[PDB]
Amino acid sequence: PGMARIRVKDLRLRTFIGIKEEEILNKQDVLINLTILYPAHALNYRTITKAIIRHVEENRFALLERMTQEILDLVMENPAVRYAEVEVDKPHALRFAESVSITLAGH
Amino acid sequence: PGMARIRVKDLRLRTFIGIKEEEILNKQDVLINLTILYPAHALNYRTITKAIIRHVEENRFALLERMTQEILDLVMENPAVRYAEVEVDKPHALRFAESVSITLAGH
Amino acid sequence: PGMARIRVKDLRLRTFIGIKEEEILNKQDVLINLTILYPAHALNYRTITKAIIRHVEENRFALLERMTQEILDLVMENPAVRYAEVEVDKPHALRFAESVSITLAGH
Amino acid sequence: PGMARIRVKDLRLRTFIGIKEEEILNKQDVLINLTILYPAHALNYRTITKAIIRHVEENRFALLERMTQEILDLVMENPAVRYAEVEVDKPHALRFAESVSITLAGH
Amino acid sequence: PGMARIRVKDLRLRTFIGIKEEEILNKQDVLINLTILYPAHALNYRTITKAIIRHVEENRFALLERMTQEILDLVMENPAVRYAEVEVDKPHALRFAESVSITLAGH
Amino acid sequence: PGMARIRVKDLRLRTFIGIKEEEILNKQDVLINLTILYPAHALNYRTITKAIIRHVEENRFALLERMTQEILDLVMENPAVRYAEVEVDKPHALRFAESVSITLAGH
Amino acid sequence: PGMARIRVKDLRLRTFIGIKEEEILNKQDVLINLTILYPAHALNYRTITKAIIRHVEENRFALLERMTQEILDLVMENPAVRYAEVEVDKPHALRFAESVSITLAGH
Amino acid sequence: PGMARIRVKDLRLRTFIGIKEEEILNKQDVLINLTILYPAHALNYRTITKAIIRHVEENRFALLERMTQEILDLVMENPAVRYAEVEVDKPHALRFAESVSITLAGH
């Protein structure tokens, strides 16, 4: 800490999130933020992103938590290093609030 | 740390805050930000929000600190887990400053 | 940590900052951000602000560091509690950069 | 921690970043953020910036990581004190994402 | 044209807008913008605003058009002069769009 | 002029725009803004939007001008009234510029 | 129309505006925007600005309208050409609204 | 009016602007906005931009007015159609103001 940190800021993707008739019939915007630690050539982050986009847009999700976890797993699938954190914002998910997000991390 | 963190970003509510004639006669805008830890189906955050909105709009407050605490308590009332942090911004409360906020946390 | 934290966000003040002919002849904008810890009625933050504004606008400064320190001291002058942090932004102080800031803290 | 922290916020520079025909033929925007610790007259940060700008604009880079490191080194070249952190954002480097950044730090 | 123009920018009010179960059970945010012409002491705009706020918050609306018209009328009720324009934004009323607004004007 | 104006602000849609290998293989973000005049119940703008979204997402475009025109036509297809203007932004289409847009209008 | 138009965007000045005890004891922020037409060497706009700043900061105002007019006059005092428009925003002058402004123009 | 309008929004370029020692030794940021009318395949706007960028970055300017005119001329050099408007912002050119711009148009 700190050392080698790569950040993917505000990756905006559209997919199905929710179970409600409208949520299942229409795609919505969700915002992904990725923090990857890998101390200390590198075609990496591009592939990780590619995979996360592909997985997110080509699927249906019932719960931000499942989506976040799936992404997190995708992030540790290829490298073994070192620490990964994923926050997923569902913009305007609550009345009167700008967003609601779920963050998950791993070693 | 980090693990399971849910964030409720910029929940904008209107209520009475202050003792001043104008503050008691007219509602004002206040901005709430909630950080909840709950390692590691979940109809939870929706209910918590519902309760915090309902409590905030349906009452009168004399001091940001009382409001923040009341919210914090509301956040730990239902689950026992795990860590909760509440920041409340009173926008343009001071001359020349964008905001003033009070943050409180608990185990 | 975390517990009782009060934040004063983007207090914009105008004063003389610098030694350069233009800096001494003309006031400039500077942005102050204050973090105060005081675990766990309170006419406090209003007075602190009052004093910091009054001190900043009614003086001349040769160096962000002196200004920041003076504010920090003003913050610990009245209460003994508990932790205080002061960041001062000199907007557009460097070519091509949004700002330059100095942060100082105390126990 | 915290103590003496100087921040250089959003230093926007244009240079060549990448190997792709377009990346080598045309300069791009990159955003640098510098955090310097130096507890506890000072013509310093101005010179550091000067050197980082000069080095960045007067060169070609094949990889954000090389650019970030080069800057970091430039930051510790003159003083011995104390801690330095450099984040470099390549705006709109990924499709659908606001930015991608690399952060590096040192003692 | 141009001459005497007063603008009330982004008046944010909460009221009931819509017929849908959720729209009738819960208040929503709406943003009002007023342009008043009165060529060429004046306690006016304050009263107009007062009346528009009071009318908007103390009622229920079935359609942006009715709300906008009601405001417009309120604007010409007191003075006879000279030209008035009212835009009402229903933020995030459409999927994927920042807002939808209705503008109405009068002589 | 002015009278009855409805505005659809920043309708963000993703579709294929361009002929370039990357433009044809990957969808991009485009921002639509609609101005409709209809002097002086109304399930209208919702349907218009529905149709414009459906047409935009379910097709491929070779040129902003074709896309803009197609939308404009969709806007006059249902009502006969009265004036319609459509601006389409292709964000970050040019190096160093925030956007490029095409606007078209009709009677 | 259009031809030679110079714009001075968001000139932020602090002065006394109002009659209320607080308004007379404390300076406030006001935002000035100037549009000057002069079809078709020029040390002009710098001097105009200089004079408007000097006049605004070195005086007390009872009413946005007086302030706006005084500025407008200052703008036509030196050149005879050609058209001038002045908007003055009093930020957060009304509850729930971002600003209130007064615009005045001349030949 | 309105009909075929293409807009190039916030083209940010760096060049030498001014006569002052610092202005001649160091490049600065300037923001260009182009409005082109051409009622009613088109490799046009790309070339126009290319030429305006190339001309702006590969030269030195003594006065926003000369720069704006040079761009305007570049815009009418290739097509004969139809109306062109060019605004050039010199960000933070005046103390306390966000920008100063010069606009010029032609038939």
Numbering used by the authors:
A (entry chain A), B (entry chain A), C (entry chain A), D (entry chain A), E (entry chain A), F (entry chain A), ...: 6 to 45, 56 to 122
What does the paper say about this structure?
FolX encodes an epimerase that forms one step of the tetrahydrofolate biosynthetic pathway, which is of interest as it is an established target for important drugs. FolX has been shown to act as an epimerase in conjunction with FolM, a reductase, during the conversion of dihydroneopterin triphosphate to tetrahydrobiopterin. Therefore, FolX and FolM are essential for tetrahydromonapterin synthesis in species such as Escherichia coli and Pseudomonas aeruginosa. Here we report the crystal structure of FolX from the bacterial opportunistic pathogen Pseudomonas aeruginosa, as well as a detailed analysis of the protein in solution, using analytical ultracentrifugation (AUC) and small-angle X-ray scattering (SAXS).
